[PDB]
Amino acid sequence: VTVILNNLLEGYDNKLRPDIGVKPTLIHTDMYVNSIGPVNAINMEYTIDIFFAQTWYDRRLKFNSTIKVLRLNSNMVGKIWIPDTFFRNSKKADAHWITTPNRMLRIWNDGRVLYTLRLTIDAECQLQLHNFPMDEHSCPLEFSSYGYPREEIVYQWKRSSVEVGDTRSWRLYQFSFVGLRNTTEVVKTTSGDYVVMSVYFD
Amino acid sequence: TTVFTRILDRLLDGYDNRLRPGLGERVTEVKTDIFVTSFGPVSDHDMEYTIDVFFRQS
Ligand SMILES: *[C@@H]1O[C@H](CO)[C@@H](O[C@@H]2O[C@H](CO)[C@@H](O[C@@H]3O[C@H](CO[C@H]4O[C@H](CO[C@H]5O[C@H](CO)[C@@H](O)[C@H](O)[C@@H]5O)[C@@H](O)[C@H](O[C@H]5O[C@H](CO)[C@@H](O)[C@H](O)[C@@H]5O[C@H]5O[C@H](CO)[C@@H](O)[C@H](O)[C@@H]5O)[C@@H]4O)[C@@H](O)[C@H](O[C@H]4O[C@H](CO)[C@@H](O)[C@H](O)[C@@H]4O[C@H]4O[C@H](CO)[C@@H](O)[C@H](O)[C@@H]4O[C@H]4O[C@H](CO)[C@@H](O)[C@H](O)[C@@H]4O)[C@@H]3O)[C@H](O)[C@H]2NC(C)=O)[C@H](O)[C@H]1NC(C)=O
Ligand SMILES: *[C@@H]1O[C@H](CO)[C@@H](O)[C@H](O)[C@H]1NC(C)=O
């Protein structure tokens, strides 16, 4: 198995995305929300803890063998190309490093890479406090690639896009979790046009 | 002494830390033990509580 990893890493330039000259790199995203933390109306923000998973294809990481899947901890996460995904409306976000880096990397023989990590995000939510305490909100959580425009990275939601746990173990003091939805948009910036995706929690 | 250094230096010869023990042979069993040196304060304003632990894994 070490031979397979050594062969995969040989002549591998992690600075270049897969299919850099051929087509956009399609990424399939999933979220499991452990807990939407408290909504801090003073600072117009809310905390959320997620397992964020991204799946893409890397032709360079194809390997022919009978193993058919390499399941790995964070050790090789820095050794290969990873998407530039970042959360647009995150005032402060942190990964988790106790006991070890809370990251997972699975590579299939056909070149499919699944990369999962645990995140805690303090996402901005501009609450319209008219009708308070009868007010209702739809707080977003947006993300996109920082550097790669739509012509280079394209995100896609899967069927089981966003999943939630019990929702009674969540830290919502004031509000009740009404519902959820997901959306995709293309946002134009000075750098270019980026495939943004939002998850709205009502 | 010399034998200690020789044992330590040659220990990681041909060792791949990317692979778990007994990969493709068995299931890695881990024995866990916790010694809570102090049960820290419980915060109602956060649904958060602190706990200082000696965490042992074998
Ligand atoms: C101005 O100056 C500041 C600094 O003052 C600077 O900010 C600094 O930026 C750097 C990045 O440029 C950042 O370093 C990296 O940290 C990564 C790990 O986490 C470190 O941070 C976490 C959390 O930090 C955040 O914490 C708060 C929020 O939660 C808040 O303060 C901040 O947001 C802060 O960022 C922290 O928990 C970590 O603690 C430890 O655990 C790490 C585990 O990976 C370990 O690396 C650390 O050394 C550290 O462990 C020691 O300390 C703990 C106790 O704290 C002990 O328990 C341990 O025993 C240790 O004594 C870290 O502090 C880290 O992953 C990055 O490491 C990689 O760096 C490059 C990446 O390509 C490689 O060269 C490195 O080798 C390494 O990559 C390897 O490891 C990763 C992780 O497993 C793998 O995925 C990679 O594939 C790769 O693996 C390979 O190599 C290793 C050998 O190296 C090999 O073993 C493997 O097999 C494999 O081959 C990187 O170190 C730094 O933390 C940050 N400092 C701050 C903010 O305080 C600013 O940028 C400067 N200004 C500007 C604008 O430039
Ligand atoms: C998320 O998006 C996918 C594809 O766009 C869709 O199938 C799914 O129903 C959406 N989730 C909702 C509406 O909760």
Under DSSP, the state recorded for A58 is -
Which residues in chain B have their CB less than 8 angstroms from residue A100's CB? none
> For residue A1, what is the nearest residue in chain B, using CA coordinates?
B19
Residues of B in contact with A1 (CB under 8 A): 16, 19, 23-24
Which positions in chain B have a beta carbon within 8 angstroms of at least one beta carbon in chain A?
16-19, 23-24, 46-47, 55
φ and ψ at A127, to 5 degrees? -85, 130
In total, chain A counts a number of residues equal to 202
Q: Is A185:A125 a contact under the CB 8 Å cutoff?
A: no
From residue A19, how far is each of A1, A15, A64, A194 by CA, in Å?
Answer: 26, 12, 20, 18
| A164 closest CA partner among A187, A185, A141, A184 | A141
Resolution in angstroms, to 1 decimal, for this deposition? 2.9
Method: cryo-EM
A27-65 burial, b for 16+ CB within 10 Å, e for fewer?
A: bbbbbbbbbbbbbebeeebbbbbbbbbbbbbbebbebee
**Tokens of residue A47, six digits:** 């905390």
Omega prior to B41 cis, within 30 of 0: no
The count of residues in chain B is 58
Tell how far the Cα of A97 is from the centroid of ligand 1, in angstroms: 9
Query: What is the least distance, in Å, from the CA of A192 to any CA of chain B?
Result: 38
Torsion angle, alpha carbons of A174, A176, A182, A186, to 10? -20
Query: In angstroms, what is the span from residue A108 Cα to ligand 1's centroid?
Result: 28
**Hey, whose CA ends up nearest to atom 97 of ligand 1?**
A75
What is d(CA A77, CA A57) in angstroms, rounded to the nearest whole number?
15
CA–CA separation, B46 and A27 (whole Å): 35
Which residues does residue A55 pair with via DSSP β-bridges, in sequence order? A28, A114
Placement of tokens 């958060």 in the chain:
B48
Instruction: Provide the pairing of β-strand A153-164 with A25-40.
Output: parallel
C-alpha R_g of chain A: 19
Q: What is the DSSP code string of A132-178?
A: TTS----EEEEEEESS--TTTEEEEEEEEEEEE--SSSS--SS----
The residue with tokens 């049960």 is: B39
Can you tell me the distance from the alpha carbon of A167 to that of A196, in angstroms, rounded to the nearest whole number? 26
